[PDB]
C-alpha cells in the first residue's frame, strides 16, 4: 500500500508512487525525477496520467516506452493547473530534469515537495521568495551534521587536473569514467573537454544522453569508440579486472588506464580533503573515487530550511527506522528554536 507521505493532502495526487498498483482516489501520479527508485513500477503497460519535466517525459517515452498520451510534460517557472490546482515545477539542483513542485491548495494551504534535491542559496531568489510554505516535503538523504563534502565547482577541478596532468605526461593513456543512471554528467564532460576529445559509450547510454536537453550535445557524446579517449562504462565494471577486460578490446591504441568513480559522501570523507586525494593502482590501471554529490550537505540543508521557515517538515527519506525519525525530528526542532520560528 501507498504510504502517506507519498500523498499531498486535500487532493488526488501522489508523488513518485508507481509501485503500488492503482492507487485509490489518485487522479494524477507526479514524478519528480527519472531514478529507478522513484519511478519504480512504471512500464510500458502504465495507463494513468503522469505529471514531470520536459526531460523527464522524453525518458519515459523514449527508456521506457510508456505511451505518449499518458505523458503531461510541464515547463519550469510556470503557473500551469491540473485538475483545478495550479502547480508549479522548480529545478532541483539535482540530474537532469529533476524538479521540486509547488502545490497551491484551494484552501489556501501552500506544499512544497524537493523530491530529490541539493539545495543551493540560489534558491532563496526563484519564485520562492516570500513565498508561505505550509508543508515541506524534504529530501533527508544527509539529514545529520557528519556530512560534509566539497562544492561540485571544487570537485570538477580536481578531476580536471588530474586527467589533464596524466594525459600530458603520458599521450596513449585512456581514461574511463564509471555511470549507472542519469546525473553527474559534469564529470565526464568537463574531463573530456580539456582533453579535446568526445566521450565515446555504447548505444544505450548514448540514446540516455539524447534524451536529456543538453545545448550541442552532438558535438560532445559519440558511438564510435575508437575516436574517443574518454569512455563511459558501467559503474559494476569499475574495478582492476574489468579494466584490464575493456583494456584488451581497444586494439593497442593505450597503454594505461586512469579512471574515476563518481561517488556520493563516503566514510573517507570524514577523514582526507579532496585536494589531498589519491588513487588505488595494479600496474598501468589507477582508480579515483571523487565525492560529487547531488543531494544538499547537512549544512546546505540547514540553510535552506532555515530561510524557508516551513510550519511543519514530512521527510521522504531515511523514514524507515525509528533511530532515523527520531534524529531528523531532533534537528528540525533545533532549526527551528535557533532561527525563531
Ligand atoms: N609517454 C612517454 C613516452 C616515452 C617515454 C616516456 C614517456 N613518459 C611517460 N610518463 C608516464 C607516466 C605514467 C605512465 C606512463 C608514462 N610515460
Ligand atoms: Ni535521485
Redesign the pocket.
Known amino acids: 500500500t501507498c504510504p502517506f507521505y507519498k500523498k499531498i493532502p486535500g487532493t488526488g495526487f501522489t508523488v513518485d508512487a508507481f509501485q503500488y498498483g492503482v492507487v485509490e482516489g489518485c487522479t494524477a501520479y507526479f514524478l519528480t525525477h527519472f531514478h529507478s527508485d522513484h519511478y519504480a513500477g512504471l512500464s510500458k503497460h502504465f495507463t494513468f496520467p503522469v505529471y514531470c519535466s520536459e526531460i523527464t517525459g522524453n525518458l519515459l517515452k523514449n527508456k521506457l516506452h510508456v505511451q505518449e498520451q499518458y505523458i503531461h510534460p510541464l515547463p519550469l517557472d510556470t503557473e500551469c493547473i491540473v485538475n483545478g490546482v495550479k502547480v508549479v515545477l522548480l529545478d532541483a539542483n539535482h540530474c537532469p530534469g529533476a524538479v521540486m513542485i509547488l502545490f497551491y491548495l484551494p484552501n489556501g494551504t501552500v506544499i512544497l515537495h524537493t523530491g530529490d534535491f541539493r539545495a543551493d542559496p540560489s534558491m532563496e531568489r526563484s519564485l520562492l521568495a516570500d513565498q508561505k510554505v505550509h508543508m515541506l516535503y524534504l529530501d533527508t538523504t544527509y539529514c545529520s551534521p557528519e556530512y560534509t563534502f566539497p562544492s561540485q565547482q571544487e570537485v570538477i577541478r580536481f578531476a580536471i587536473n588530474t586527467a589533464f596532468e ?1 594525459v600530458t ?5 585512456l581514461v574511463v569514467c564509471g555511470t549507472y543512471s542519469i546525473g553527474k554528467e559534469k564529470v565526464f564532460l568537463a574531463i573530456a573537454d580539456v582533453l579535446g576529445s568526445k566521450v565515446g559509450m555504447s548505444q544505450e547510454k548514448y540514446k540516455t544522453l539524447q534524451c536529456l536537453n543538453i545545448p550541442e550535445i552532438n558535438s560532445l557524446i559519440t558511438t564510435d569508440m575508437c575516436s574517443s579517449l574518454v569512455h563511459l562504462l558501467p559503474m559494476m565494471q569499475i574495478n582492476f579486472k574489468g579494466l584490464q577486460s575493456h583494456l584488451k578490446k581497444c586494439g593497442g591504441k593505450y ?2 588506464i586512469l579512471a574515476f568513480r563518481p561517488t556520493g559522501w563516503t566514510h573517507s570523507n570524514k577523514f582526507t580533503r579532496i585536494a589531498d586525494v589519491i588513487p588505488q593502482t595494479k600496474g ?1 590501471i589507477s582508480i579515483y573515487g571523487i565525492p560529487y554529490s547531488e543531494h544538499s550537505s547537512y549544512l546546505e540543508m540547514k540553510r535552506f530550511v532555515q530561510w524557508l521557515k516551513p510550519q511543519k517538515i514530512i521527510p521522504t527519506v531515511n523514514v524507515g527506522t525509528w533511530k532515523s525519525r527520531s534524529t531528523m525530528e531532533k534537528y528540525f526542532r533545533e532549526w527551528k528554536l535557533e532561527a525563531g520560528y
Open positions: 596524466a605526461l603520458n599521450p596513449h593513456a597503454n594505461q598501468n
